[PDB]
Design a protein around this ligand. Structure first.
Ligand code: F8E
Length: 292
């Protein structure tokens, strides 16, 4: 059963309309804001749940206000039954949009333009001293307004972790860290139980764009964490570039050379996407595949 029934009113302000998803770490609802009249997104987690992600969600979301590709923060609170975060509601997510494609693939035009936007998201979260650690298509969605439908947003921050400390320096990595995020888009370092860094969020971006353009990843059907890790360790990553723009070699070589300590060259990755667009006559004003 759902944590919240339909028509439930959170803090005499947010009326639950329907459940829109969730799964692991909690549930997400569409709610009507009775004070603003705006349809909002409401994230709730049981107060008797062992892992409490919503405190992190709020901290990162607050830090990212003013930045592009982030939901506006509406409110938050906690009671004896559940914890909640209220934020700007968006349109369809990228995993849903990709699955709705005829061949489950996007065009290089959509792939490259989403890549630019997701990369700007990653750069922004890293700029406030946090790692995302759960970069996947279902964590990104297009806007639902006429002024936002072409903009891509980073939806969740539950598995995020501060990599900087109080003084603005990079904190020492732990000798071991428990696996965080999706199994499909996790880097080989995450599979090895190593402390995740900025480069690991760029590995997830790399895998996601290959899946966008090709429609699948070699380890698509394998659910076992260890088995996927062995495939990724053994798999010659150059093979993933077979149907990708040629500048993607530069992207793969860059991330493969990084570690926890080294700041990524975000501009190098951006130039890969920009050159892959200009060399194909791809315009920034083009329509996305779902608009076709
Ligand atoms: C893992 O994420 C999902 O599966 C999922 C997430 C959302 N999340 C959102 N959907 C729409 N607007 C949102 N704002 C903040 C979060 C959010 C909605 C539906 C699914 Br189906």
């Amino acid at each position: 059963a759902d944590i919240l029934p339909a028509n439930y009113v959170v803090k005499d302000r947010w009326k639950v309309l329907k459940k829109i998803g969730g799964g692991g770490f909690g549930e997400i609802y569409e709610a009507m804001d009775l004070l603003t009249r705006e349809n909002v997104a409401l994230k709730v987690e049981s107060a008797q749940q062992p892992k409490q992600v919503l405190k992190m969600e709020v901290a990162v979301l607050k830090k990212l206000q003013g930045k592009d590709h982030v939901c506006r923060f509406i409110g938050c609170g906690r009671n004896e039954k559940f914890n909640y975060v209220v934020m700007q509601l968006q349109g369809r997510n990228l995993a849903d949009l990709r699955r709705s494609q005829p061949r489950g693939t996007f065009t290089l035009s959509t792939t490259l333009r989403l890549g630019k936007q997701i990369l700007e998201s990653i750069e922004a979260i890293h700029s406030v001293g946090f790692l995302h650690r759960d970069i996947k298509p279902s964590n990104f969605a297009m806007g639902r307004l006429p002024s936002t439908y072409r903009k891509c947003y980073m939806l969740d921050f539950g598995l995020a972790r501060q990599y900087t400390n109080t003084t603005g320096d990079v904190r020492p990595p732990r000798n071991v860290a428990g696996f965080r995020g999706t199994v499909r888009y996790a880097s080989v370092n995450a599979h090895k139980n190593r402390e995740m860094g900025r480069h690991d969020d760029l590995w997830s971006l790399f895998y996601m764009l290959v899946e966008f353009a090709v429609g699948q990843l070699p380890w698509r059907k394998i659910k076992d964490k260890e088995q996927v890790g062995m495939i990724k360790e053994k798999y010659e990553h150059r093979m993933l570039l077979k149907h990708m723009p040629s500048e993607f070699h530069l992207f793969l070589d860059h991330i493969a050379s990084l570690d926890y300590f080294t700041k990524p060259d975000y501009q190098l990755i951006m130039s890969v996407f920009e050159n892959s667009m200009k060399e194909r006559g791809i315009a920034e004003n083009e329509a996305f595949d779902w608009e076709k």
